[PDB]
Ligand SMILES: CCCCCCCCCCCCCCCCCC(=O)OC(CO)CO
């Protein structure tokens with residue numbers, strides 16, 4: 378109903394950014410479903426998706442910091458749940474991603490080591506902005522949790 | 524050769540994150556190329572890419588805020604170039620993306636309006652964090668641009 | 671009392687009067703009042719007496735402006751469009767970007783006039799300064815709006 | 820490199836679904852010397868047609884950026900960027916928003932019989948436009964001071 382329209386739009390949000398529709402719909406579903414935890418089979422049914430589709434997109438959302446795998450006592454099935462404060466956890470992963478990109482800027486700067494310094498301006502700006510934003514976000518998340 | 528390695532690593536960075544390899548390579552190239560502006564054909568031939576591949580991924584990088592389409596005087600070719608302060612521009616786009624997600628959180632909250640408040644906790648957390656971070660990042664970019 | 675097609679027509683006129691396409695205005699108007707909110711490409715072409723090409727190109731424009739979104743369903747291979755949540759706020763966010771891009775262009779112009787008398791660059795400086803100020807104003811305002819009004 | 824900035828302004832316009840010529844014309848009037856330019860001077864500068872200059876100048880006047888003027892002892896039509904042109908452009912945007920908000924009101928009346936949920940989009944539109952009109956008007960007043 379209105380719920381599946383929300384899930385649909387989460388799919389579009391992802392799709393419009395070159396990410397998978399299914400990952401978006403999965404994130405969406407995990408934001409509104411009841412109970413919060415969902416088995417692999419429940420997700421496949423809910424989303425009209427293959428088990429392979431569920432597995433690969435769940436893996437991606439775990440990588441990005443939004444959801445987690447969990448086990449339920451007495452049950453052998455695989456479960457997933459949106460993490461507590463999931464979008465904060467997402468931002469923590471983005472800090473790590475920014476540091477990774479910083480390291481790549483170094484690679485580029487070394488590669489341009491022989492070239493005029495002006496040519497390296499773009500990479501220096503990238504590295505400097507990333508270093509700045511990592512601190513901004515880390516500090517901000519610290520305060521938020523308080 | 525060392526430049527090419529950087530470009531490939533940028534491809535890998537994008538690809539590890541469910542984005543296209545070519546978008547990453549294209550961003551990498553626009554970070555290091557000389558001159559900074561590059562024609563569609565220059566990009567395709569530098570990156571071993573089709574025209575369709577260049578067009579699709581250039582458009583994505585424009586969406587993401589990193590590069591711009593460029594018109595060149597007396598020249599009919601399409602050009603692209605890294606935006607000024609490109610990663611700041613990318614962060615501005617992130618603020619906009621966060622605002623879009625916050626709008627969606629509100630849609631979700633309305634959809635759950637008849638359900639117990641507990642069921643909406645996840646969406647409230649999402650909404651609140653996004654609103655907070657949008658403001659934090661906007662303020663920070665303002666302070667930074669004054670450097 | 672007005673009806674929906676009078677509104678749609680007037681939205682078309684609003685767009686055309688500003689050198690935008692009439693069909694883009696009518697399409698935006700339709701997506702503001704249609705039920706259901708989501709519409710297929712075919713449904714839009716039918717309702718507006720338009721070609722599939724017209725719907726496609728004008729839908730693309732409204733997406734770029736930030737007002738509408740493309741949707742798709744795995745089982746379905748029709749293209750759907752829908753007005754975005756908080757569409758005009760989203761539109762205003764795109765305007766913030768547009769002003770930033772114009773500010774960057776003003777910088778290009780200022781550099782090109784580097785060897786001219788500074789009086790000649792007054793117009794560009796005014797452009798740059800107004801845009802910087804309005805970007806901040808609008809950004810702050812949309813942040814505050816999201817809280818609610 | 821002046822023609823480079825001009826060409827780039829043409830691009831900005833064409834990207835937002837306006838004419839390349841209107842963008843080039845605005846660009847030219849931002850950097851030209853003297854600030855005032857005759858119709859023929861504009862056509863020559865931009866390698867443009869007189870009809871193109873006329874049409875696009877009218878649009879830039881409508882948008883608030885430039886003005887048509889007369890020069891004593893001269894028969895020619897002249898144009899010039901307005902003082903604080905982008906503030907003037909913003910003033911015109913406020914007026915455009917008010918017009919658009921009036922249309923939202925038409926839409927709301929047209930849906931008066933329907934369930935109120937169906938009018939949510941139009942209510943959001945109206946609310947945002949009003950809010951922004953107030954914000955921008957306030958901001959422009961403060962800026963001029
Ligand atoms: C090993 C580390 C793992 C970390 C977790 C994997 C990634 C988490 C999500 C990544 C999002 C993908 C962004 C793609 C564009 C890169 C832009 C960028 O990051 O910086 C710009 C952001 O706006 C600065 O301007």
Ligand SMILES: CCCCCCCCCCCCCCCCCC(=O)OC(CO)CO
Nearest residue numbers: 688735761762764765881911912914915918
């Ligand atoms: C008769 C009353 C006269 C008033 C003066 C008329 C002059 C109109 C100039 C301004 C409007 C330009 C056209 C835009 C129509 C869509 C709104 C917009 O541009 O797009 C969104 C894009 O993201 C921003 O919200």
